[PDB]
C-alpha cells in the first residue's frame, strides 16, 4: 500500500535525495564544505551542546526525585510486563553498542596519547582518559535517552497519542501540531534518527572491514564495503519480508548474552584485579569530578579537542534519541517515572562504565606496562584498535571473529530497529505501515552510510550527526519543558 | 517633630561623631591604629567569618528545602505585588551594584597577577581568578542577603513586628528586646549599615575620580572628592522634600536597563563565544570546587591574602546585610520561604556571575592574548581598571562616560535607600520621621565616606567594614537560629 | 559441667577451640607463623582492597539513605519509647566505645607518616600536609562512624523493636526467619565473636605498645616482652577484680572520667599549641575532606600500585568492620526511644566531627611544627611509630606531666576496653543477655589478654593488623548482607505499622 504521511514522507525523501546528490555530483566541493560546516557548528555551539546535555540530565534527575516520580506510565493500574532485572537487561540492549565496540579501546587510548587537558605523568593521562570516556559514555548519554524515552512513554501511554516527536509538544502547542509545526519537528526527528543510524552503520562497517584486513590480510575496497552494506541490508530485510520478528527479536538477547560472555572473557583473561580496582576508582573519580568535566568547555586553551570527541558525542546522543528513547519507551509500560528514570540512568550507565573499564582500562594497563604498539595502531587508524587489543589475549583469532560477528549482529539489529522507528515516525501509522516502507528505509540508511563513508568516512558521519543534532538539541530542550508541563497536567488531573 | 528612638539615635550619633573626631584630630595615630586593628581582626577571625558565611548559606538552603519552605511571607493570603519574572530582576539588592562596577575587572586581574594559591600556568591563574571572583560575588553574598531578607520579611509580615533588627530575636530573647538588649543590636545594625553604605559611597567616588582623571586628566584633589560627595548628597536631598520620584525610584529599572545595556555591549563587542564558554565552564568549576574554596582558610601558606579579599568581602556582605535585606524583604510579600530563598539565591547570583564573566573574563582573555597593560594599570591603582578595560573597545570615551553616569546613579540610589533604612532603624514604625532626619543621615554617610577616604582611602573602608562586621557576624548567626525557632513556632501555631 | 554454665553451644566450644588452635600455632610454629601471617595479610589486602572500599562506601551510603528515607521516622524501642538521656548527653556518649586507644596511637603517628610517606605523589610539603590531613580524616571520619551507626542501628532495631537477643544472628531474621538456630546463625555468631575478640585484642596490643614506648621514652626503662605480658596480666587482673566486686557502675564512672580527661587533654593541646592555626586547619581540612570525599573514599591506588593501602586504608576498613559489633552493641544499648534518622545523624556527624577535631588538634599541630622546620617527629616516627605522641609532647610545657596523663588515659581506656569487650563477647557467645556467671566474662577478658600477648610476641603491630584484616575480610560480606537484612526488617516494621 501507500500508508504514508504526505508532508513528512515526501519532505524527508527529497531532503535525503538532495543530500545524496550533492555528495555524489560534487566529489570535491562537499569534501571541503562538510569539514568547514562541522567546525563552525562545533566551535560556535559546543557551549550550547554542553548546556543542553547538562540541563537534560538535571531535568531527568529532578523528575526522578520530585512529585512527578510517582506517576506510573500507562496509567495507575498499569502493570510492568517484565521484572526489574529483565527490564534492566533489556535497557542495556537499546544502547546499540556498535559505538561501544568501536570506541571501548580507541577512545581511552586516544585520550591517553592526545590528552584533553595537559597532564604531568602517564598515570594522570590514564586517569583523565578514563574520566573523559566515562563522561562520554556515562550519565549524560543515558540521561538524554531516559528523558526522551520518558517523554515518549508518557505521551504514548498516559495520553494515548502516537509515539511520535510531534505529539511530545502537545502541552503548549495544543492542536497546532498538525501542519508545518509538528511536520517540521517530525521531519527533523526522522532526519536525526536516519543520520544517527547511518553513523552507527558506518562505524560498524568500518570496524568490520578493519577486522577482516587485520585478520586475513585482505584489501577491502570501498566497493567491497558498499557490497557488504547492501548484502547486510538485504539479509535484514529478508526477515521483514518473510518471518517478521524472528530471528531478530531473539537476536537482541543473543547479542546481549554474547557481549556479556565477551566482556567476561576479557575481564578474566585480562588484569582482573586491576580491572576491578580501576572500575571502582574510576567510577568514584568520574562522580567526584562530575561537574568539572560535564561543564568543561576548553575555554582558555582553545585546543579544539571537544570538536571531535565531546561535542560530537553530545550531538550523536541527541540525534540518536528519537530511536533509543523510542525503544526504551516501548518496553517500559507500567513503570513509575522515578523508577523508570533510575533504571535507565544508573544500571545501563554502570554496565557501560564496566565495559569501558574492562576494555579501555585493560588497554591502558597494557600501555602503562611499556607496550605501546596499541598507541601506534590507534594513531595509524582508529578502526583496528580493538583487534590490536585482542592481540594481547589468548585465542586472538577466535576473539576477533567473535567481535566481528557481534558487530555484524549489532548492525543487523540496529538497522531493523531504526527502520521500524523511522517508518513509524515518518508514516505516522504506528504499526499499520506496509513492509516495503521499512525495507525502503533500511535501503535509505544503507545508501546514506555508503555515501558518507565514500565522502569522508568517519569525519562525514561526525559532521552529519553534529549538524542534525544541533537543532534537535534545541528541540530536546523544548521537549523537556513540554514533558514537565504534561506531567504537571497529569498530576493536576489526578489526585482529586 | 523629633520622632526618634532615644537610646539608638543618640548612641549611634555619639559613636559616629566620636570616630569622626578621632580620625580628624589624630591624623597619623589613626593611620597606624586602624591597619593594625584590621590586621588583628582578620588574622584572628577569618576562620570565624568563613564559618559564619558557610553556615548562613547552608541554613538558607536548608530552609528552602525543609518543612519551613511552604511557609508564605505575610500569611496564607498570598497576593504578591509583582510577578516572579519581574521579581527576579527587582531582587538585585538595593541596586545592581557599585562594588560590582569597582571589582568587575580589578578583582579578576588582581587574582591573576597576585594568585590566592600557587599555580603553574597562566591558564590556571585565570581559572583560579574567575573561581575566587565567583566565590566572593556568588552564592555566599546572596545567601547572607537572602537569610537577612527572609528574617525581616517573616518578622515584619507574618508577625507584624517593625522591620528592625531587634525584632528578629523575639523568638529567642522573648519580650526582653526592648531595652539595652535590643537597643545594642539596633545600634550595631545601624552602625554596620552606615559603614557598608559609606564604603560603597567611597568606592563610587574613588572610581568616578579615577575615571575623570583617566578621561581628561583633571587631577581631582581630595577636596574635590569631598565636594563631589557633598554635591551628590545635596542632589539626593533635593530628591527628598519634593515627594521623591524625581529623583529616586525613577532610576529603576532605568539603572537596571542601563546596566543591562552596558553588559550587553561589552558581551557583544568583546569575545562573545569566549564569554559564553567561560561563563558555562567557570560556573561549573565554581560549583565543582564549592566546598574547597568556601572553607579554604590559607592555613598552611599563611600568605595573608584573605585579609584583603575574602575576609573583607564576607565582612562587607555581613555589614551590608540590613541595608540589602530591608528591600529584599519589602518587595517580597506573599511568596513562600522556599520560593523566596531560591529566587534570591539562584537568579541574582547567576546574573552576578554572568556580569563577572562578561567583564573580568573578557579582561583575562585580553591578558592571556598578550596585552598586559591592564595588569600594570591594576597594580598602579585598581580604581582605573574598568576604564583601562574600556580602552579595548569601540567608543571608549562614550562607554567610560556611561559607566561614570551609572556609578553616579547607583550612588544616588544607594545613598537614598541607606538613608531610609537607617532612619527606619533609628526611629521605627516605618512611617516616621520627617525627612530632615533622612537628610541628616545622608549627610552623615557622606561625611563618614569623606573622612575614611582622607584617612586611608580604600584601606580605611575595608577596616571599618571588617571591624563593624565581626560582631554583626555573631549577631547574624544568632539571628539565623532565632529565625529558625520563629519559623518552627509559626509552623506549630498553624494547626 | 554443672548449673554454673550458661554457655550457648557450640559457639562457646567452637570459638574457644579456634582461639586455642591459633594460639598453639603461633606459640609452637614461630617461623611458620612469621612467614605465613604477612603473606596471608598481603594476599587478602591486595585481592580485596577494592571489596573493602566498596563495603565501607556502601555501608555509609546505606546509613545516609536510611537517615533520609521513609525509614527515618521509625523510633527504636517502639513508637511510645522515650530516650533515656538528653540529646547532648547522648551525643557525648556516642563519642565513645571506640576506646580512644587507636585515636591516641594514631593522633600524631598517622599524619606524620602520611607526610613523610605520602599516599600519592605531591610536589610541595604543603600539599603533603594537606593530603596527610585528608587521608587521616578519611580513615577516622565518616566511614568508621557509618559502619558503627549501621551495626548499632541493626542491633537496636532487632533488640528493641523485635525483642530478639542482641546478637548478630538475629540481625538476619528478615532473610532466613527461623533458620538461625544452628550452623547458619551459629557460624555468624562464631565469626562475630572472633572478629570482636580480635579487634579488641588489636586495641589492647596498641595500648600496651604505646604505654611501653611512653615508659621507655620517659624513664629510660627497658621493657622486655615479659614485662609487657606482666602489664597485660596486671590489667586483666585489677579489671577482673573490679568485675568480681560488683563494680558495674565503677566502669561507667571510669568511662565518664575518661571522657572528661580526654576533653581536658585536647583542650590543653589546643590552647598551648597553635590555637589559631588549629582552628583554621580544622575548618579548612574538614572542608577539603568533604570536597574530595568521593575522590578519596573510592581511591584504590590502581595505577601506581604502591601497596600503601595495604597498611593504612584497607587495615582501617578491616579494623572498623571487625570492630563494629563491639562498638554497635553499646551504641545500640544507649539509643532507645530515638528515631532512625536522629540516631544515624547523631552517630555520624557529632562523633565524626569531634574525632576530626581531635585529629586536627594533634596531627595538624604536629604538621605545623614539622612545616616550621622541626623534623624530629618525622625521624621519631620512622624509628618507631609508638613514641610519636610523646615526642609530640616534647614541644609543650609540662612535657612529663602531659606524658604521664596520656599514659594514664591509655591505661584507663585499656580497662574500659577490656571490660566492655568482655561483656560483649560473653553476651554473644553465651546468648543470654547478661545472665552468665562472672567467671565467663573473666575468662573472656583473660582470653583477650592472652591473644594480645601472643600477637605482640609474634610480630607486634604487624600481627595485630594481620589478625584484624583476616578476621574482617568475611565480616565485610556479613555486614553487607546485614545491611539489606536491616532494610528488609525496616520495611517489615513500616508495613506492620500504620494499622
UniProtKB/Swiss-Prot annotation, chain A:
Sequence intervals crossing the membrane: 6-26, 45-65, 85-105, 137-157, 177-197, 224-244, 256-276, 308-328, 340-360, 393-413, 447-467, 468-488
Entry membrane topology: Multi-pass membrane protein
Free-text function comment from the UniProt entry: Catalyzes the transport of trimethylamine (TMA) from the environment into the cell. Binds TMA with high affinity, but does not bind trimethylamine N-oxide (TMAO), glycine betaine, carnitine, choline or dimethylsulfoniopropionate (DMSP). Together with the TMA monooxygenase Mptmm, is part of a two-step metabolic pathway that improves both growth and survival at high hydrostatic pressure (HHP).
Keyword Transport on entry: yes
Source species of the chain: Myroides profundi
Keyword entries, A-Z: Cell inner membrane, Cell membrane, Membrane, Transmembrane, Transmembrane helix, Transport
Gene induction: Expression is induced by HHP stress.
Gene (name only): tmaT
Entry's localization field: Cell inner membrane
One Gene Ontology CC term in the entry: plasma membrane
InterPro entries according to UniProt: BCCT_transptr
Recorded family membership: Belongs to the BCCT transporter (TC 2.A.15) family.
GO MF, one annotated term: transmembrane transporter activity
Source superkingdom: Bacteria
Identification of the protein by name: Trimethylamine transporter
Swiss-Prot record, chain B:
Function: Catalyzes the transport of trimethylamine (TMA) from the environment into the cell. Binds TMA with high affinity, but does not bind trimethylamine N-oxide (TMAO), glycine betaine, carnitine, choline or dimethylsulfoniopropionate (DMSP). Together with the TMA monooxygenase Mptmm, is part of a two-step metabolic pathway that improves both growth and survival at high hydrostatic pressure (HHP).
GO molecular function: transmembrane transporter activity
Transmembrane annotation, as ranges: 6-26, 45-65, 85-105, 137-157, 177-197, 224-244, 256-276, 308-328, 340-360, 393-413, 447-467, 468-488
Transmembrane helix is among the record's keywords: yes
Similarity annotation: Belongs to the BCCT transporter (TC 2.A.15) family.
UniProt keyword terms in alphabetical order: Cell inner membrane, Cell membrane, Membrane, Transmembrane, Transmembrane helix, Transport
GO cellular component, one term: plasma membrane
Keyword ATP-binding: no
Official protein name in the record: Trimethylamine transporter
Organism: Myroides profundi
InterPro entries assigned: BCCT_transptr (IPR000060)
Primary site of residence: membrane
Induction data: Expression is induced by HHP stress.
Compartment list: Cell inner membrane
Membrane topology value: Multi-pass membrane protein
Curated annotation (Swiss-Prot), chain C:
Job description of the protein: Catalyzes the transport of trimethylamine (TMA) from the environment into the cell. Binds TMA with high affinity, but does not bind trimethylamine N-oxide (TMAO), glycine betaine, carnitine, choline or dimethylsulfoniopropionate (DMSP). Together with the TMA monooxygenase Mptmm, is part of a two-step metabolic pathway that improves both growth and survival at high hydrostatic pressure (HHP).
Membrane-spanning intervals of the chain: 9-29, 48-68, 88-108, 140-160, 180-200, 227-247, 259-279, 311-331, 343-363, 396-416, 450-470, 471-491
Keywords: Cell inner membrane, Cell membrane, Membrane, Transmembrane, Transmembrane helix, Transport
Name of the protein this chain belongs to: Trimethylamine transporter
Upregulating conditions: Expression is induced by HHP stress.
UniProt similarity note: Belongs to the BCCT transporter (TC 2.A.15) family.
CC annotations in GO: plasma membrane
Record has Nucleotidyltransferase as a keyword: no
Keyword Cytoplasm: no
